[PDB]
């Protein structure tokens, strides 16, 4: 599962992100070209320091976050300048708000486009670039993300920031809850499962275990709960034996059909009753059929 902490596309230009070149630098623009909003073009300024900060996205429980970018770019030689846009981030603890302190922002890899550059804007061409990066481990209660411009004509369309979690699942008659994924490749989050209703752990067997990885995936289930006597596995829950069926022991077997010379059993039966006269040997299990009484 993915949990989004910021989606610029969903806000639709409602997010008043702060820009360090106050006006005429990083600025928000509307361009219904299809309405699609985008932040966008000052190349003639040689040594420029154009920055764009996002809102104080609350870290919550996340450990490693992912940034998905959709954007368009210019050629830098079509109009007679660079293109290597830079991504940054801040690991803070309080929402300062109007505090574009560029001194502490730890540049992420220099994002670059692929596919097509400026081409033709709207007249003789109508496709973007979806590039994703990630940072971590994050340990402060808050975190910010930024974008730096040294002179490129870019217009950025979709900024999505999300983190990964292992979803809930019902495996082996046991319930494993939703657990936050980790940050770094070696880390595995071992999680113990809770037996579903009417499931019990076998006497000589391990308790149900599942391992949650940094990619938000469950791996190597260990152990398993079992449907007890009178119940059978259905989907991933325990269901009472249908009438006319029994389950002698708490096992992996499905409900067994009633044996010879026995009356139909009620719902969720442990054993099928002998007939009007037929008896079963005291030592014999309830899996055995009945016999008459000479």
């Amino acid at each position: 599962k993915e949990v989004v902490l910021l989606d610029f596309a969903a806000a639709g230009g409602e997010l008043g992100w702060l820009t360090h070149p106050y006006g005429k630098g990083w600025d928000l623009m509307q361009n219904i070209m299809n309405p699609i909003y985008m932040y966008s073009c000052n190349v003639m300024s040689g040594d420029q320091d154009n920055w764009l900060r996002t809102n104080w996205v609350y870290r919550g429980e996340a450990e490693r976050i992912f940034i998905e970018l959709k954007f368009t770019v210019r050629d830098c030689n079509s109009f007679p300048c660079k293109e290597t846009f830079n991504l940054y981030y801040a690991e803070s603890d309080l929402d300062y708000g109007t505090n574009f302190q560029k001194r502490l922002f730890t540049k992420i890899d220099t994002i670059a486009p692929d596919e097509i550059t400026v081409s033709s804007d709207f007249e003789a061409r109508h496709k973007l670039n979806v590039e994703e990066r990630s940072v971590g481990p994050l340990t402060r209660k808050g975190f910010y993300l930024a974008f730096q411009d040294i002179g490129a004509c870019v217009a950025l369309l979709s900024v999505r920031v999300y983190y990964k979690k292992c979803p809930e699942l019902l495996q082996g008659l046991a319930h494993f809850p939703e657990t936050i994924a980790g940050s770094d490749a070696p880390s595995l989050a071992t999680v113990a499962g809770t037996c579903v209703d009417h499931a019990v752990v076998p006497p000589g067997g391990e308790e149900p275990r599942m391992h949650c990885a940094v990619d938000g995936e469950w791996l190597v289930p260990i152990g398993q709960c079992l449907c007890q006597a009178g119940y059978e596995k259905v989907e991933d829950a325990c269901q009472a034996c249908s009438p006319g069926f029994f389950k002698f022991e708490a096992s992996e077997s499905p409900c067994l059909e009633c044996p010879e010379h026995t009356l139909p059993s009620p719902e969720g039966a442990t054993s099928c009753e002998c007939e009007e006269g037929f008896f079963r040997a005291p030592q014999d299990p309830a899996s055995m059929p009945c016999t008459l009484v000479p």
Partner: antibody
Amino acid sequence: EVQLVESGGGLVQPGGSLRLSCAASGFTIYYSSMHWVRQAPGKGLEWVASISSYYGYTYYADSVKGRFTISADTSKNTAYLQMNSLRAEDTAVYYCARYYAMDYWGQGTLVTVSS
Amino acid sequence: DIQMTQSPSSLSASVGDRVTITCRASQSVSSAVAWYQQKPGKAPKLLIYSASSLYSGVPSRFSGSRSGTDFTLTISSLQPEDFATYYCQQYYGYGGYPITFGQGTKVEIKR
């Protein structure tokens, strides 16, 4: 899901022999009793044979006792009915089904017995 | 060999009517009774088991009842997909005694 497939039917001269096959998938046939039921053309249902591999008992009907043989191969997940010394009265469509309260049925295979 | 005597052999009714088929066994058969539906061409289809329990996935308008040796299949409001032939079956003893069926009951559309 659960599915049962039948094969083996056709003509046989009176007094001949023929073997029928019931290919199962979606459940273990050891854990379930398998039965053969025939439906004469235009007539009702008539029970032919039963088998439960868990207890190893084989139950026949009177009109077919001695002439028909039920059997089951646990490995191939398949049930069989071997028919010998066939007569015209045996002409019918043969079905196989799981459990005494038959819940999943095969599609049915036609056995014609005549000269 | 137990006998199942299904009555009636045939009955004609209209859509929406309540329909009742009876099957009387020649001996106490406990609850070892099942009811089946067979449209022409297709194979039978299980409807009721234990003579009063609805097979999972069968529309609930079908119900089975027992009054002693008298087993009834009942349909609250006959739908067009319900015109077919219906068989009762007894499986008392799960093989101690032979399996026998009702003689069947074809339900046809009134017109």
